């Protein structure tokens, strides 16, 4: 649909933080739409890029891809501007065929969105314990 | 046996510190069980890995191996997160044959556990004086 | 944690279907835990594989990876057993560094779990309209 300010709520370890993302256009070279947090510093923005890919003569499948990039800043003694210490990434790729109905795709999407709240996933992502 | 929280007591130069270690699963690739301190920072954890090794066509002996890794953190002026300055290691390997009884193995284990409290060893490990 | 049946609820286009997944062990060759639907046919199972990866001398980052595979069956006139016509895939990879706290990782996880319910994502995944 149309790009708009996505204001996601109830985020975090406790569940009280919010994240508002402003749209920043669609890249014409590769068809990748971008959104970022209004933090006003071009290196310290939490950003989300979403792009759907048409079929070619080499893929023949629809490919949806979502990337989330979150950098962490730190102030320094030796400089007055903060720098990027580390970044956290997330990369989701859906691959659907040329005959799939929308019920199957909504089942995959809601299965992933409900499976990222399981105790298995909140123990394997947060505390990094293998499933055992 | 079953992995469990090993809460070792009376540790240190004076003998009053305790160390509680939580289990973090068994690595399926090489059969190495891990335990670590609940310090909640994935780089600043004191960790202990124990693994027993079955005989192969190249070793034909049972091999028990215990590793202890203790990193030391330091805060910095220039960053807000602490980093690892140095690490202390320990590596114990027991090698038993295919005909050894359990009394011999308990003799080796308790000999090492009582020999790590001798004045020779607490002078050679703590103060790093050669035996002379 | 430990593998156990994961009975996910309120799934689908309408929001009323449930999916119960039974654990089927951990692969020792690569450390990939598997779960699948109890559909009793080994080719028609909706399956989910989750695996976390330790650092090596070539990656030096923790890598969590989740795969979802959903096949669709169809009966045939010419055979008595159903076959797999097509499959729907999903592949999520989290890449965290060696100094990240758990609040940042929970922020990434809950950001993705709340961002898969936005109108942008339910219009780009379901109806396949570009943004």
């Amino acid at each position: 649909a149309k790009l708009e300010t996505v204001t996601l709520g109830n985020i975090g370890k406790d569940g009280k933080q919010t994240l508002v993302l402003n749209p920043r256009g669609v890249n014409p070279t590769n068809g990748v739409a971008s959104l970022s947090q209004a933090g006003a510093v071009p290196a310290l923005e939490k950003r989300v890029t979403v792009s759907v890919s048409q079929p070619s003569r080499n893929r023949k499948n629809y490919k949806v891809q979502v990337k989330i990039q979150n950098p962490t800043a730190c102030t320094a003694n030796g400089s007055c501007d903060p720098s990027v210490t580390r970044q956290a990434y997330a990369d989701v790729t859906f691959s659907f065929t040329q005959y799939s109905t929308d019920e199957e795709r909504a089942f995959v999407r809601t299965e992933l969105a409900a499976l990222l709240a399981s105790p298995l996933l909140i123990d394997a992502i947060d505390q990094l314990n293998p499933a055992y | 046996a079953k992995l469990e929280t090993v809460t070792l007591g009376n540790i240190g130069k004076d003998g009053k510190q305790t160390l509680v270690l939580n289990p973090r699963g068994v690595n399926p690739t090489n059969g190495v069980a891990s335990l670590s301190q609940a310090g909640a920072v994935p780089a600043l954890e004191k960790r202990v890995t124990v693994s027993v090794s079955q005989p192969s066509r190249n070793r034909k002996n049972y091999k028990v191996q215990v590793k202890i890794q203790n990193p030391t953190a330091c805060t910095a002026n220039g960053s807000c997160d602490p980093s690892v300055t140095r690490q202390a290691y320990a590596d114990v390997t027991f090698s038993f044959t295919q005909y050894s009884t359990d009394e011999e193995r308990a003799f080796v284990r308790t000999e090492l556990a009582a020999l790590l409290a001798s004045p020779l060893l607490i002078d050679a490990i703590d103060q790093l004086n050669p035996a002379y | 944690a430990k593998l156990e049946t994961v009975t996910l609820g309120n799934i689908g286009k309408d929001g009323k279907q449930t999916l119960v997944l039974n654990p089927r062990g951990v692969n020792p060759t690569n450390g990939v835990a598997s779960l699948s639907q109890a559909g009793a046919v080994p080719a028609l199972e909706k399956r989910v594989t989750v695996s976390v990866s330790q650092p090596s001398r070539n990656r030096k980052n923790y890598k969590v990876q989740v795969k979802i595979q959903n096949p669709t069956a169809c009966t045939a006139n010419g055979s008595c057993d159903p076959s797999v016509t097509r499959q729907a895939y999903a592949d999520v990879t989290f890449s965290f560094t060696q100094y990240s706290t758990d609040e940042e990782r929970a922020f990434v996880r809950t950001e993705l779990a709340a961002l898969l319910a936005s109108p942008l994502l339910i219009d780009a995944i379901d109806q396949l309209n570009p943004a």
Partner: antibody
Amino acid sequence: SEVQLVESGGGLVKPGGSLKLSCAASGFTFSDYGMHWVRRAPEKGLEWISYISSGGSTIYYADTVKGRFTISGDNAKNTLFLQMTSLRSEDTAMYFCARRGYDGHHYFDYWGQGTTLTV
Amino acid sequence: AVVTQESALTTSPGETVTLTCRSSTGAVTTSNYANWVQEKPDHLFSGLIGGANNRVPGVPARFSGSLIGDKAALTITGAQTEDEAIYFCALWNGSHWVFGGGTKLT
């Protein structure tokens, strides 16, 4: 709506074993729900006993109990079993049953009313 | 988290109040799936608030779960007179669920 009730059992059993707790589920089915057992000692706090999950594939048995209780389910008539072999020392409780809900959702959400089983 | 503990405080009807649930060994985390149980004094229990933020359908809107600090919290906004009960806590320590003592809200 959905009302649970546990009534089977509650006799003055000698310390030898051989009793059965059972509850009947009304507003749901055991296809996508699991059931807990908790144990309120007559003046202490609650204590979790055991759990079968949805469909009966993962069973736990907290380690004061494992070996001498058995929990099972019977999908005909929608009932939930609890069959032991010994009643050793205390085992005095209003035994409640909980209905572990959906997986991202609440895990002790629609309770029973308890049966007093004295040894 | 082999044992857990909380207080037995009380409050007036005319403003908010919080309830902590402190794990004895270390801190609570996301893996400690913390959810709350409400007991009306006919020993009629009820599920109150799920693990992350969730509520049981039927629980009113003046109820929120938290991870304030190192303790699983329970914020009741404008506590009226009908929830004059005792509240129970729960943690999964990796092997078995652990319930705590009550909190006699009056």
